[PDB]
Amino acid sequence: HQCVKLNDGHFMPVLGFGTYAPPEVPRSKALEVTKLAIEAGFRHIDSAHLYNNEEQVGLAIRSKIADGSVKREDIFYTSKLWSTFHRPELVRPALENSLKKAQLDYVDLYLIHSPMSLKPGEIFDIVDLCTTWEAMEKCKDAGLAKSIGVSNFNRRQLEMILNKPGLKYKPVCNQVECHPYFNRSKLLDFCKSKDIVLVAYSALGSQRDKRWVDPNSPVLLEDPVLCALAKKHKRTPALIALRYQLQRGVVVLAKSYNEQRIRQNVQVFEFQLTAEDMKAIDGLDRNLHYFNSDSFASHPNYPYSD
Ligand SMILES: NC(=O)c1ccc[n+]([C@@H]2O[C@H](COP(=O)([O-])OP(=O)(O)OC[C@H]3O[C@@H](n4cnc5c(N)ncnc54)[C@H](OP(=O)(O)O)[C@@H]3O)[C@@H](O)[C@H]2O)c1
Ligand SMILES: C[C@@H]1CCCCN1S(=O)(=O)c1ccc(N2C=CCC2=O)cc1
């Protein structure tokens, strides 16, 4: 295992467990798989208000602390502020609600989930995200979140926060879709220049949910270059996709609700890719965001406009 030092001095483990499962998966499965993830060695656990699982994920964490397997300070838990709660007066209550659902005193990381503000209390809203970010800074000062960051921001959106007059805490990270078909090189370079960690979701090619993903889109884990690399290293396409991210300096999430795959994914630390391997993977980039829906693409702050 290892950690990256965030720009506020806290540490984030480089491999994260993805906890989202679509609604057909019974809620209690999150409890079970989160416990297995922790048994396999995951210490970074990624959730959100949106994922409707914070109560099960928090209960997994508390159970593994309660039985001596881990201490609270060995777990890095992320939640996220949903886009109906961008108005500043809504931010701390949203974080408090997440904390109550998970039964934790603090989150290691709290993210603005998306720049795409939605109308509260119920379609887009226009919110000054610099005001949302001030509200986020307040949550760090209160000890509700050790660190704060963003998700789904593009470069212009991130700059807007970084250039805020009176900025107190830079975002520690930008959690974004990132994988060999959509590798975000230029955004990564920008993030690296500002000491903001890029965190990759859908690093294994997404769950291909029919609500948002084109089933015609290429299946990342069937890619022939990943398959060739998997054979060369005697690993699996998933492990090649994860290892790629680690060697680019990207913190990588990995969702699995399968016991065997959960245990396999921690092997990312057991091997290395060469410069030539990495070049071959870099050759797959093709501007493919799996999340590609009419329900998002017209939003005035849709990030894939730039
Ligand atoms: N910030 C945001 O807007 C945002 C958006 C999307 C996701 N996320 C976060 O990112 C996490 C991960 O992304 P994601 O949900 O798109 O899924 P992902 O990590 O890309 O995984 C996709 C599929 O890979 C399969 N898989 C996992 N390990 C494998 C292995 N070793 N070999 C073969 N298949 C494997 C899993 O199926 P099985 O369960 O059957 O193993 C999984 O459904 C989410 O759970 C959530 O925590 C955040
Ligand atoms: C998918 C859209 C368009 C691309 C940027 C991000 N978003 S979003 O912020 O509207 C968003 C983020 C996450 C989700 N989501 C829904 C269930 C799992 C999941 O991550 C849905 C929409």
From Swiss-Prot:
Changing R211P: Decreases in the retinaldehyde reductase activity. 3-fold decrease in the kcat value, whereas the KM value does not vary. Its main location: cytoplasm. Strongly inhibited by nonsteroidal anti-inflammatory drugs (NSAID) including flufenamic acid and indomethacin. Also inhibited by the flavinoid, rutin, and by selective serotonin inhibitors (SSRIs). The oxidation reaction is inhibited by low micromolar concentrations of NADPH. It is found in: Cytoplasm. GO terms for cellular component: cytoplasm; cytosol; extracellular exosome; nucleus. The active site is at Y51 (proton donor). Substrate binds at H113. It comes from the Eukaryota. This is Aldo-keto reductase family 1 member C3. It comes from Homo sapiens.
